[PDB]
Design a protein around this nucleic acid. Sequence first.
RNA 1: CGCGGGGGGAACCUGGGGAACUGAAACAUCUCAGUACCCAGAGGAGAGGAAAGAGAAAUCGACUCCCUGAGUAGCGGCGAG
RNA 2: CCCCGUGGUUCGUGGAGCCAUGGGGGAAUCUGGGCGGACCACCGCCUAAGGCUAAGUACUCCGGGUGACCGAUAGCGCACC
RNA 3: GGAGGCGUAGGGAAACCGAGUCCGAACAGGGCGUCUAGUCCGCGGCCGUGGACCCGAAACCGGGCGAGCUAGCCCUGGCC
RNA 4: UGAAAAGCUAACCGAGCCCGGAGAUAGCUGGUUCUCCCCGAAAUGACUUUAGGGUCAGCCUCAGGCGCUGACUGGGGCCUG
RNA 5: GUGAGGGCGCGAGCGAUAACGUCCGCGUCCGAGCGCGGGAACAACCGAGACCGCCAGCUAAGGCCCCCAAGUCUGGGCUAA
RNA 6: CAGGCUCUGGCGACUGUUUACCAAAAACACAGCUCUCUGCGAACUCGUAAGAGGAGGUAUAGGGAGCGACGCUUGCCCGG
RNA 7: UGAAAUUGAACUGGCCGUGAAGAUGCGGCCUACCCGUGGCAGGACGAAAAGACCCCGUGGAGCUUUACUGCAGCCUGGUGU
RNA 8: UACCACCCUGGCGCGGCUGGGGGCCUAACCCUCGGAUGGGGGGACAGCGCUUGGCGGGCAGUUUGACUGGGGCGGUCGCCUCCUAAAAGGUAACGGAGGCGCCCAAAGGUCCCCUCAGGCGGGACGGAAAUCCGCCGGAGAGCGCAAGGGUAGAAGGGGGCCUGACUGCGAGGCCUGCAAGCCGAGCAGGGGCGAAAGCCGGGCCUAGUGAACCGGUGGUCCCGUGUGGAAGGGCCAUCGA
Lengths: 100, 44, 63, 76
Amino acid sequence: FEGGRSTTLMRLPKRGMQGQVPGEIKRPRYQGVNLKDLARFEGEVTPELLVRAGLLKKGYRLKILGEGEAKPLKVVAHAFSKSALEKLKAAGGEPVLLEA
Amino acid sequence: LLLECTECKRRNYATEKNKRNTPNKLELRKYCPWCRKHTVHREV
Amino acid sequence: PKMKTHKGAKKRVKITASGKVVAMKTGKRHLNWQKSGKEIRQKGRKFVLAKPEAERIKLLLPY
Amino acid sequence: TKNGRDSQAKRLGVKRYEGQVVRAGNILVRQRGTRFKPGKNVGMGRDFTLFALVDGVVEFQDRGRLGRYVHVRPLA
RNA sequence: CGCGGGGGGAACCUGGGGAACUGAAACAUCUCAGUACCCAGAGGAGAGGAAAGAGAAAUCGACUCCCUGAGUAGCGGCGAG
RNA sequence: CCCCGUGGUUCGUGGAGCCAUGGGGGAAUCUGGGCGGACCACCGCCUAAGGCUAAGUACUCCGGGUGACCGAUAGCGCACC
RNA sequence: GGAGGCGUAGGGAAACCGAGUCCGAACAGGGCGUCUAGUCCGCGGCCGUGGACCCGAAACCGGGCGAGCUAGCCCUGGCC
RNA sequence: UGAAAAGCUAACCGAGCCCGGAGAUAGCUGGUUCUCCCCGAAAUGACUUUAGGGUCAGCCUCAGGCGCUGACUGGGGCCUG
RNA sequence: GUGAGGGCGCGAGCGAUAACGUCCGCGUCCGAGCGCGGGAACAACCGAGACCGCCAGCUAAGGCCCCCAAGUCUGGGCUAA
RNA sequence: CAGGCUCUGGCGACUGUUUACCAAAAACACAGCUCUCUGCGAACUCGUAAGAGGAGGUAUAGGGAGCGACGCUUGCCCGG
RNA sequence: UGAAAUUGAACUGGCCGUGAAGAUGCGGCCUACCCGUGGCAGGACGAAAAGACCCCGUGGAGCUUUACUGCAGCCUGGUGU
RNA sequence: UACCACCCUGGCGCGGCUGGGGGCCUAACCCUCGGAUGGGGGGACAGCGCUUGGCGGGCAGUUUGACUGGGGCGGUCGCCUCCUAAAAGGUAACGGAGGCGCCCAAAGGUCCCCUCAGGCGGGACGGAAAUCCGCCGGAGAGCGCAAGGGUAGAAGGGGGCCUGACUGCGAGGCCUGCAAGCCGAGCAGGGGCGAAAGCCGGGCCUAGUGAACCGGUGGUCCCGUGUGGAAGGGCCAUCGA
Ligand SMILES: [Mg+2]
Ligand SMILES: [Mg+2]
Ligand SMILES: [Mg+2]
Ligand SMILES: [Mg+2]
Ligand SMILES: [Mg+2]
Ligand SMILES: [Mg+2]
Ligand SMILES: [Mg+2]
Ligand SMILES: [Mg+2]
Ligand SMILES: [Mg+2]
Ligand SMILES: [Mg+2]
Ligand SMILES: [Mg+2]
Ligand SMILES: [Mg+2]
Ligand SMILES: [Mg+2]
Ligand SMILES: [Mg+2]
Ligand SMILES: [Mg+2]
Ligand SMILES: [Mg+2]
Ligand SMILES: [Mg+2]
Ligand SMILES: [Mg+2]
Ligand SMILES: [Mg+2]
Ligand SMILES: [Mg+2]
Ligand SMILES: [Mg+2]
Ligand SMILES: [Mg+2]
Ligand SMILES: [Mg+2]
Ligand SMILES: [Mg+2]
Ligand SMILES: [Mg+2]
Ligand SMILES: [Mg+2]
Ligand SMILES: [Mg+2]
Ligand SMILES: [Mg+2]
Ligand SMILES: [Mg+2]
Ligand SMILES: [Mg+2]
Ligand SMILES: [Mg+2]
Ligand SMILES: [Mg+2]
Ligand SMILES: [Mg+2]
Ligand SMILES: [Mg+2]
Ligand SMILES: [Mg+2]
Ligand SMILES: [Mg+2]
Ligand SMILES: [Mg+2]
Ligand SMILES: [Mg+2]
Ligand SMILES: [Mg+2]
Ligand SMILES: [Mg+2]
Ligand SMILES: [Mg+2]
Ligand SMILES: [Mg+2]
Ligand SMILES: [Mg+2]
Ligand SMILES: [Mg+2]
Ligand SMILES: [Mg+2]
Ligand SMILES: [Mg+2]
Ligand SMILES: [Mg+2]
Ligand SMILES: [Mg+2]
Ligand SMILES: [Mg+2]
Ligand SMILES: [Mg+2]
Ligand SMILES: [Mg+2]
Ligand SMILES: [Mg+2]
Ligand SMILES: [Mg+2]
Ligand SMILES: [Mg+2]
Ligand SMILES: [Mg+2]
Ligand SMILES: [Mg+2]
Ligand SMILES: [Mg+2]
Ligand SMILES: [Mg+2]
Ligand SMILES: [Mg+2]
Ligand SMILES: [Mg+2]
Ligand SMILES: [Mg+2]
Ligand SMILES: [Mg+2]
Ligand SMILES: [Mg+2]
Ligand SMILES: [Mg+2]
Ligand SMILES: [Mg+2]
Ligand SMILES: [Mg+2]
Ligand SMILES: [Mg+2]
Ligand SMILES: [Mg+2]
Ligand SMILES: [Mg+2]
Ligand SMILES: [Mg+2]
Ligand SMILES: [Mg+2]
Ligand SMILES: [Mg+2]
Ligand SMILES: [Mg+2]
Ligand SMILES: [Mg+2]
Ligand SMILES: [Mg+2]
Ligand SMILES: [Mg+2]
Ligand SMILES: [Mg+2]
Ligand SMILES: [Mg+2]
Ligand SMILES: [Mg+2]
Ligand SMILES: [Mg+2]
Ligand SMILES: [Mg+2]
Ligand SMILES: [Mg+2]
Ligand SMILES: [Mg+2]
Ligand SMILES: [Mg+2]
Ligand SMILES: [Mg+2]
Ligand SMILES: [Mg+2]
Ligand SMILES: [Mg+2]
Ligand SMILES: [Mg+2]
Ligand SMILES: [Mg+2]
Ligand SMILES: [Mg+2]
Ligand SMILES: [Mg+2]
Ligand SMILES: [Mg+2]
Ligand SMILES: [Mg+2]
Ligand SMILES: [Mg+2]
Ligand SMILES: [Mg+2]
Ligand SMILES: [Mg+2]
Ligand SMILES: [Mg+2]
Ligand SMILES: [Mg+2]
Ligand SMILES: [Mg+2]
Ligand SMILES: [Mg+2]
Ligand SMILES: [Mg+2]
Ligand SMILES: [Mg+2]
Ligand SMILES: [Mg+2]
Ligand SMILES: [Mg+2]
Ligand SMILES: [Mg+2]
Ligand SMILES: [Mg+2]
Ligand SMILES: [Mg+2]
Ligand SMILES: [Mg+2]
Ligand SMILES: [Mg+2]
Ligand SMILES: [Mg+2]
Ligand SMILES: [Mg+2]
Ligand SMILES: [Mg+2]
Ligand SMILES: [Mg+2]
Ligand SMILES: [Mg+2]
Ligand SMILES: [Mg+2]
Ligand SMILES: [Mg+2]
Ligand SMILES: [Mg+2]
Ligand SMILES: [Mg+2]
Ligand SMILES: [Mg+2]
Ligand SMILES: [Mg+2]
Ligand SMILES: [Mg+2]
Ligand SMILES: [Mg+2]
Ligand SMILES: [Mg+2]
Ligand SMILES: [Mg+2]
Ligand SMILES: [Mg+2]
Ligand SMILES: [Mg+2]
Ligand SMILES: [Mg+2]
Ligand SMILES: [Mg+2]
Ligand SMILES: [Mg+2]
Ligand SMILES: [Mg+2]
Ligand SMILES: [Mg+2]
Ligand SMILES: [Mg+2]
Ligand SMILES: [Mg+2]
Ligand SMILES: [Mg+2]
Ligand SMILES: [Mg+2]
Ligand SMILES: [Mg+2]
Ligand SMILES: [Mg+2]
Ligand SMILES: [Mg+2]
Ligand SMILES: [Mg+2]
Ligand SMILES: [Mg+2]
Ligand SMILES: [Mg+2]
Ligand SMILES: [Mg+2]
Ligand SMILES: [Mg+2]
Ligand SMILES: [Mg+2]
Ligand SMILES: [Mg+2]
Ligand SMILES: [Mg+2]
Ligand SMILES: [Mg+2]
Ligand SMILES: [Mg+2]
Ligand SMILES: [Mg+2]
Ligand SMILES: [Mg+2]
Ligand SMILES: [Mg+2]
Ligand SMILES: [Mg+2]
Ligand SMILES: [Mg+2]
Ligand SMILES: [Mg+2]
Ligand SMILES: [Mg+2]
Ligand SMILES: [Mg+2]
Ligand SMILES: [Mg+2]
Ligand SMILES: [Mg+2]
Ligand SMILES: [Mg+2]
Ligand SMILES: [Mg+2]
Ligand SMILES: [Mg+2]
Ligand SMILES: [Mg+2]
Ligand SMILES: [Mg+2]
Ligand SMILES: [Mg+2]
Ligand SMILES: [Mg+2]
Ligand SMILES: [Mg+2]
Ligand SMILES: [Mg+2]
Ligand SMILES: [Mg+2]
Ligand SMILES: [Mg+2]
Ligand SMILES: [Mg+2]
Ligand SMILES: [Mg+2]
Ligand SMILES: [Mg+2]
Ligand SMILES: [Mg+2]
Ligand SMILES: [Mg+2]
Ligand SMILES: [Mg+2]
Ligand SMILES: [Mg+2]
Ligand SMILES: [Mg+2]
Ligand SMILES: [Mg+2]
Ligand SMILES: [Mg+2]
Ligand SMILES: [Mg+2]
Ligand SMILES: [Mg+2]
Ligand SMILES: [Mg+2]
Ligand SMILES: [Mg+2]
Ligand SMILES: [Mg+2]
Ligand SMILES: [Mg+2]
Ligand SMILES: [Mg+2]
Ligand SMILES: [Mg+2]
Ligand SMILES: [Mg+2]
Ligand SMILES: [Mg+2]
Ligand SMILES: [Mg+2]
Ligand SMILES: [Mg+2]
Ligand SMILES: [Mg+2]
Ligand SMILES: [Mg+2]
Ligand SMILES: [Mg+2]
Ligand SMILES: [Mg+2]
Ligand SMILES: [Mg+2]
Ligand SMILES: [Mg+2]
Ligand SMILES: [Mg+2]
Ligand SMILES: [Mg+2]
Ligand SMILES: [Mg+2]
Ligand SMILES: [Mg+2]
Ligand SMILES: [Mg+2]
Ligand SMILES: [Mg+2]
Ligand SMILES: [Mg+2]
Ligand SMILES: [Mg+2]
Ligand SMILES: [Mg+2]
Ligand SMILES: [Mg+2]
Ligand SMILES: [Mg+2]
Ligand SMILES: [Mg+2]
Ligand SMILES: [Mg+2]
Ligand SMILES: [Mg+2]
Ligand SMILES: [Mg+2]
Ligand SMILES: [Mg+2]
Ligand SMILES: [Mg+2]
Ligand SMILES: [Mg+2]
Ligand SMILES: [Mg+2]
Ligand SMILES: [Mg+2]
Ligand SMILES: [Mg+2]
Ligand SMILES: [Mg+2]
Ligand SMILES: [Mg+2]
Ligand SMILES: [Mg+2]
Ligand SMILES: [Mg+2]
Ligand SMILES: [Mg+2]
Ligand SMILES: [Mg+2]
Ligand SMILES: [Mg+2]
Ligand SMILES: [Mg+2]
Ligand SMILES: [Mg+2]
Ligand SMILES: [Mg+2]
Ligand SMILES: [Mg+2]
Ligand SMILES: [Mg+2]
Ligand SMILES: [Mg+2]
Ligand SMILES: [Mg+2]
């Protein structure tokens, strides 16, 4: 507020999809965990282990991606970045999500 | 008079301005869409 | 107690990862009737604010 | 008593003076009509504005009956 | 003839009614606020309570209260709120 | 149950469902009927129009305990008939 | 007591993709974002919400109290 | 209520009194308490149902970072009516 | 914090080549330097920027016949009001 | 104890009424004139209602309005 | 016997200057031993009352209408009785 | 131009649905009668309930601008031009003067061609001034409109073809409290004129305008409340000050 003229609320909402009545539309949310941070520890990584130790936090949908260096470990996830897919392809094993 | 040029064989538009009573009953100048490239455009 | 996100703001502004405030461009939804192509085009982008930037930042925060 | 009118100042004139480095295409002179003409690497827009087309330095030159010209003597 | 009601209680409780200042830097929608206050009734509490529930999990399993969810999802002269 | 007028909900008529109901029309008994945000289909959930129910919760007239609470212009309006 | 919060990745209205991403036919340009920081507690300065430094209206509204003054009438008497 | 003045309605009636909402609001006026030390403004501009009020800029000050750039001055070059 | 500015010199408009008038521009002092010397007295005119002490010293403006520090100084003119 | 009188204007017919506490008047009121509503479960007023007043009255009555004894009189205009 | 409003503190003179432009309080000059009592109203911009006039406040309130919006009341179609 | 068939315009006879108008009745409802289970008047009206539109200071809440050599009254309120404005930019007053709220499919792009105003002389109608020829005539014309700056080495007049009055961008700056305003090389697409060099993202230029919100029409990678659609919304375009 103030001046008592127009604030700057002269600007405008391109924020279309502002929201409907019944409200939020529930749907799977993917969080990216960058494989360089994943690579840190070892063994075999899973959605649980990942959240169980620092990243994720029950956002539920795991997505290894990004830059770094892939550990030769197995890595269960919900989706891999094209780029991430390859870095780990050339070093180890990589399975997809459960499904639902 | 304000005008909006539709593309022929389609449904695009343009920022336009006829002149009604002054010798401009017609209007079908040439213009250029984003679908494809270059065509005729009616008054509409 | 507990500040309220100024819903009216967030509905029209974005806070850039660095810390800047981005907002749409004014002057493109009405006055038009035949403004240049150059006009409407440059009105499509979005920009940054400076000092009022720091005004809105405070109206969000939990956001 | 009708008279309180005026327009707001348009702030025009030479913007960059002779012997001054200039970047790619920054304005050099804003003028009412053609108080100045183009020159080496110096075009002009709708409002008769005069801007650089290259980097380098600005130099002025009076050509009498011809006009007063302004151009950029590049270097790199 | 027999059992019961009547009236009172600081605050708390439920139900029937229910404002304006003020805020929006004016003001009418809006806000203050179902608050203040009036009324009836309950009682050591009162209300609620065993799903014609929620809502996306081929999941949960009465009601109440606290933390969180969240200043989120939304509502809004998309203003103030 | 649908329609008209409204109230409740975050929901100010909004694509407006849900719960409630003043007016009008007005069923069914499980092959019944309600709901999952207009509507329709599919797939789920749930059984309305009778009732009761402890504890966990709120309050401090009252008694007790305690204070980086007051010390008679303070502390309750009243230390005192 | 790990429910929960903040932080670890951004860009986009979103679908989405991701060290990128959006605009775009574009391996032109350009915006924003990458090449890491953070959080918890104490203390201080300011900001927001509440009375928010203190004292002061004229007013408005809700419930009650007044016709033993004064105004009108009703009943019954008195006076000139 | 008024043979009418907005008269009277408990010594101030253009809407009585008390209590409550209540710490209404007051861009107005007033007031704001120990000591020393360094720095030190402004009364412009833009917009403002704005003009004795605000928002941004300007001018003050503190903390961290930069390192001869600052005022002023010498030379030289261009612009000026 | 400030968004009343004020006077003076200069440059303009307004004004009447009025105003302790007004309105801009450049500067300045008061504001906040009503602290100190000068101008009899007197924010802003001339002098000068008060850290404290001294019964020391030079000077600034101004001044040196007495009130009142210091020359009834020197030389050449003018004035008789 | 106990009227100064007379002439002549304005306003208001007249006795009354009023600003308790700066206005007693040329202000209100008044008898009287005109317009208008009202057929009685009247019209109108108070009340959410029941109800009450109107009136235990009935158009020579009741409500509303303006003018205001009395005398003479009260013209033209129905576009808004 | 014995009050009151008022009251920064007083050791409270005239003129001409002067100053925020109406000086007991600054400048210069003039006059004046100390303290009362009775009496006057020129000054103390004398007391009283946070100017009623005037302007300002996006202050209040009473009132008007072919200002806006709303409610009572009334009229009216549909429908229930 | 028999006859048969679907159908039209208008109307009549039957039933189905459905409404409007008159009359009578009594039992609802209402009034009344020395209690009445009743009798008399009214009567499906009126009253009342829900819903419709209207009239509606009787009542309620508010609103009724700022500048302003006090207020009011008057004037003015945004944009352009020129002066004030003191040779950078800026710069005030209820200081001095004038415009804008448009217009043009050619008044736009390009290629080629062309050069005025005005003065003197000569010319049938003309007549100071039509049109014609001569000479002189650097800009005093013209540039849609105010004014200024510019300008014939064209921005002015004519013609041919044309539609860059583009789409996707946009280095770099002017200007500036913010928001906004302005100039812009060059890149891709695809095209116009031209021999080519090259020019074209409207008009010689500086006025001809309006943030946001709410909504309309066209479209379209997007969202669509359990799923598939739909409702609606978003995005792009444009519209209503
Ligand atoms: Mg918009
Ligand atoms: Mg959202
Ligand atoms: Mg690899
Ligand atoms: Mg046509
Ligand atoms: Mg059209
Ligand atoms: Mg960050
Ligand atoms: Mg973040
Ligand atoms: Mg940061
Ligand atoms: Mg617009
Ligand atoms: Mg675009
Ligand atoms: Mg959060
Ligand atoms: Mg002016
Ligand atoms: Mg100008
Ligand atoms: Mg100006
Ligand atoms: Mg000017
Ligand atoms: Mg018994
Ligand atoms: Mg009991
Ligand atoms: Mg009891
Ligand atoms: Mg309740
Ligand atoms: Mg209730
Ligand atoms: Mg109010
Ligand atoms: Mg108000
Ligand atoms: Mg509410
Ligand atoms: Mg309640
Ligand atoms: Mg009862
Ligand atoms: Mg009781
Ligand atoms: Mg219980
Ligand atoms: Mg119960
Ligand atoms: Mg059961
Ligand atoms: Mg239903
Ligand atoms: Mg209905
Ligand atoms: Mg309806
Ligand atoms: Mg309903
Ligand atoms: Mg309610
Ligand atoms: Mg509701
Ligand atoms: Mg709510
Ligand atoms: Mg609501
Ligand atoms: Mg609703
Ligand atoms: Mg229902
Ligand atoms: Mg119902
Ligand atoms: Mg149901
Ligand atoms: Mg459900
Ligand atoms: Mg659904
Ligand atoms: Mg269910
Ligand atoms: Mg059940
Ligand atoms: Mg059942
Ligand atoms: Mg049951
Ligand atoms: Mg049950
Ligand atoms: Mg039950
Ligand atoms: Mg119980
Ligand atoms: Mg407890
Ligand atoms: Mg105790
Ligand atoms: Mg105790
Ligand atoms: Mg104790
Ligand atoms: Mg103790
Ligand atoms: Mg005591
Ligand atoms: Mg005490
Ligand atoms: Mg003591
Ligand atoms: Mg005491
Ligand atoms: Mg007590
Ligand atoms: Mg006691
Ligand atoms: Mg006693
Ligand atoms: Mg006692
Ligand atoms: Mg995001
Ligand atoms: Mg790139
Ligand atoms: Mg850039
Ligand atoms: Mg990039
Ligand atoms: Mg970049
Ligand atoms: Mg980071
Ligand atoms: Mg901390
Ligand atoms: Mg803190
Ligand atoms: Mg702050
Ligand atoms: Mg807050
Ligand atoms: Mg307060
Ligand atoms: Mg505070
Ligand atoms: Mg605060
Ligand atoms: Mg009495
Ligand atoms: Mg009496
Ligand atoms: Mg009286
Ligand atoms: Mg009393
Ligand atoms: Mg009195
Ligand atoms: Mg009274
Ligand atoms: Mg009062
Ligand atoms: Mg009142
Ligand atoms: Mg108060
Ligand atoms: Mg304020
Ligand atoms: Mg200092
Ligand atoms: Mg200063
Ligand atoms: Mg101001
Ligand atoms: Mg401030
Ligand atoms: Mg400020
Ligand atoms: Mg430093
Ligand atoms: Mg160095
Ligand atoms: Mg230097
Ligand atoms: Mg120099
Ligand atoms: Mg120089
Ligand atoms: Mg000022
Ligand atoms: Mg000034
Ligand atoms: Mg100054
Ligand atoms: Mg000055
Ligand atoms: Mg002067
Ligand atoms: Mg100073
Ligand atoms: Mg002095
Ligand atoms: Mg003097
Ligand atoms: Mg001073
Ligand atoms: Mg001085
Ligand atoms: Mg000496
Ligand atoms: Mg000397
Ligand atoms: Mg000397
Ligand atoms: Mg001598
Ligand atoms: Mg001599
Ligand atoms: Mg006698
Ligand atoms: Mg007598
Ligand atoms: Mg006599
Ligand atoms: Mg007489
Ligand atoms: Mg009389
Ligand atoms: Mg008479
Ligand atoms: Mg008498
Ligand atoms: Mg009387
Ligand atoms: Mg009297
Ligand atoms: Mg009397
Ligand atoms: Mg009185
Ligand atoms: Mg009185
Ligand atoms: Mg009398
Ligand atoms: Mg009277
Ligand atoms: Mg009468
Ligand atoms: Mg008569
Ligand atoms: Mg009649
Ligand atoms: Mg009434
Ligand atoms: Mg009534
Ligand atoms: Mg009666
Ligand atoms: Mg009677
Ligand atoms: Mg009558
Ligand atoms: Mg006659
Ligand atoms: Mg007449
Ligand atoms: Mg006549
Ligand atoms: Mg008439
Ligand atoms: Mg007629
Ligand atoms: Mg007529
Ligand atoms: Mg004396
Ligand atoms: Mg003296
Ligand atoms: Mg004295
Ligand atoms: Mg002195
Ligand atoms: Mg003296
Ligand atoms: Mg005496
Ligand atoms: Mg005595
Ligand atoms: Mg005296
Ligand atoms: Mg006397
Ligand atoms: Mg005295
Ligand atoms: Mg006096
Ligand atoms: Mg006052
Ligand atoms: Mg106003
Ligand atoms: Mg008001
Ligand atoms: Mg009022
Ligand atoms: Mg009318
Ligand atoms: Mg009328
Ligand atoms: Mg109405
Ligand atoms: Mg009706
Ligand atoms: Mg009806
Ligand atoms: Mg009916
Ligand atoms: Mg039949
Ligand atoms: Mg029929
Ligand atoms: Mg039939
Ligand atoms: Mg019939
Ligand atoms: Mg009949
Ligand atoms: Mg009969
Ligand atoms: Mg009968
Ligand atoms: Mg019968
Ligand atoms: Mg009935
Ligand atoms: Mg009977
Ligand atoms: Mg009967
Ligand atoms: Mg009967
Ligand atoms: Mg009958
Ligand atoms: Mg009959
Ligand atoms: Mg009938
Ligand atoms: Mg009926
Ligand atoms: Mg009417
Ligand atoms: Mg009326
Ligand atoms: Mg109305
Ligand atoms: Mg009305
Ligand atoms: Mg009113
Ligand atoms: Mg209000
Ligand atoms: Mg208004
Ligand atoms: Mg004003
Ligand atoms: Mg005036
Ligand atoms: Mg004056
Ligand atoms: Mg006026
Ligand atoms: Mg403009
Ligand atoms: Mg100019
Ligand atoms: Mg000039
Ligand atoms: Mg200048
Ligand atoms: Mg000039
Ligand atoms: Mg100068
Ligand atoms: Mg200058
Ligand atoms: Mg000059
Ligand atoms: Mg100049
Ligand atoms: Mg002038
Ligand atoms: Mg227009
Ligand atoms: Mg053409
Ligand atoms: Mg000629
Ligand atoms: Mg000749
Ligand atoms: Mg001839
Ligand atoms: Mg001729
Ligand atoms: Mg001739
Ligand atoms: Mg020229
Ligand atoms: Mg012209
Ligand atoms: Mg011109
Ligand atoms: Mg000029
Ligand atoms: Mg010109
Ligand atoms: Mg010119
Ligand atoms: Mg020229
Ligand atoms: Mg010219
Ligand atoms: Mg040409
Ligand atoms: Mg042209
Ligand atoms: Mg052409
Ligand atoms: Mg740029
Ligand atoms: Mg900017
Ligand atoms: Mg423009
Ligand atoms: Mg500009
Ligand atoms: Mg042109
Ligand atoms: Mg210009
Ligand atoms: Mg709005
Ligand atoms: Mg929209
Ligand atoms: Mg589509
Ligand atoms: Mg696209
Ligand atoms: Mg889909
Ligand atoms: Mg789709
Ligand atoms: Mg759902
Ligand atoms: Mg699902
Ligand atoms: Mg669906
Ligand atoms: Mg759609
Ligand atoms: Mg759509």
